[PDB]
């Protein structure tokens, strides 16, 4: 009668040199805020891991903490251990994470081909990451395609959300959610980035791009501010006008008009991914030709 499974363990930070437990190669797997990710090896199991190197301070401390909490979610990259060591005398935190070999979301899409129903199933999985986060009052605030790596190159490899460098915390019965903690509008710009990734998912380019010799509001940044974009053919010719209408509710200019991660997930095109059009999509050839 009690949520036993709801007790997860809080972080125990190892303070011995991480070079007892891992070989640490000089080779970089990626780059993220505050940290380069080197590839390391467990010295005992010889298994292969990702190491991010932050330098101690309330930013660093905050990433480890927030991220440790989100580590439980299946769709967020799993933390193996966190070490607090002395790196040349200056003190820093070391995050050891699982490895993700499937590449970025888009790279592992840019070779085949990709259909709507398949993008819907993909958009759902990112949504679960985002819906878990907001349910524990964390906003990621840098959800981009480069923060999305696949575990393996198997067809059954998971899509996982990396990097908590910019992630931030957001804090009777008929009481209203305002009173129960004001909560800014941070979860909001995850919802925006979800649209941007939904948009780039279906056609193969971003809704906002660089072009200056035109008519009204040239700036890459003015098009963002105004909310000036739309869905060209052919790329969008046959794309569900239900789906376009969904992308209209995340790419709202006004943060208060956007769709909440819950509304997003309950919304049909996501929820029932397994009963949307299986119709073709230009992504694979669009995203390939351009580059
Ligand atoms: C992303 C980078 C951005 N920010 C993060 O906080 C972050 N956390 C991560 C955890 C695991 C991996 C990971 O699994 N990386 C891997 N990368 C490769 C790889 O093949 N890299 C090649 C890149 N190089 C040739 C330029 C294999 S596994 C990358 C991460 C990143």
Curated annotation (Swiss-Prot):
Keyword annotations:
ATP-binding, Cytoplasm, DNA damage, Isopeptide bond, Kinase, Nucleotide-binding, Nucleus, Phosphoprotein, Serine/threonine-protein kinase, Transferase, Ubl conjugation
Please list the residues that carry the modification Phosphothreonine: 279
Detail which positions bind staurosporine: 98-100
State whether keyword Chloroplast applies: no
- Residues with PTM Phosphoserine: 217, 273
Q: Which GO terms describe its molecular function?
A: ATP binding; calcium-dependent protein serine/threonine kinase activity; calcium/calmodulin-dependent protein kinase activity; calmodulin binding; mitogen-activated protein kinase binding; protein kinase activity; protein serine kinase activity; protein serine/threonine kinase activity
- What Enzyme Commission number does this protein have? 2.7.11.1
Q: Which residues form the Protein kinase domain?
A: 23-270
Catalytic activity as recorded in UniProt: L-seryl-[protein] + ATP = O-phospho-L-seryl-[protein] + ADP + H(+); L-threonyl-[protein] + ATP = O-phospho-L-threonyl-[protein] + ADP + H(+)
Q: In which tissues is it expressed?
A: Expressed in all tissues examined.
Q: How is its activity regulated?
A: Activated following phosphorylation by p38-alpha/MAPK14 following various stresses. Inhibited following sumoylation. Specifically inhibited by pyrrolopyridine inhibitors.
GO annotations of cellular component type: centrosome; ciliary basal body; cytoplasm; cytosol; extracellular exosome; nucleoplasm; nucleus
- Protein's UniProt keywords contain Cell inner membrane: no
Q: Where in the cell is it found?
A: Cytoplasm; Nucleus
Q: What is the effect of changing residue 279 to A?
A: Slight decrease in kinase activity
> What binding partners and quaternary form does the record give?
Heterodimer with p38-alpha/MAPK14; this heterodimer forms a stable complex: molecules are positioned 'face to face' so that the ATP-binding sites of both kinases are at the heterodimer interface. Interacts with PHC2. Interacts with HSF1.
Q: Which family does it belong to?
A: Belongs to the protein kinase superfamily. CAMK Ser/Thr protein kinase family.
Role noted for this protein: Stress-activated serine/threonine-protein kinase involved in cytokine production, endocytosis, reorganization of the cytoskeleton, cell migration, cell cycle control, chromatin remodeling, DNA damage response and transcriptional regulation. Following stress, it is phosphorylated and activated by MAP kinase p38-alpha/MAPK14, leading to phosphorylation of substrates. Phosphorylates serine in the peptide sequence, Hyd-X-R-X(2)-S, where Hyd is a large hydrophobic residue.
Q: What is the protein's name according to its record?
A: MAP kinase-activated protein kinase 2
Q: What's the source species for this entry? A: Homo sapiens (Human)
Upper lineage is:
Eukaryota, Metazoa, Chordata, Craniata, Vertebrata
Point out the gene that encodes the protein.
MAPKAPK2
The shown chain, on whole-protein numbering, covers 42 to 346 of 400
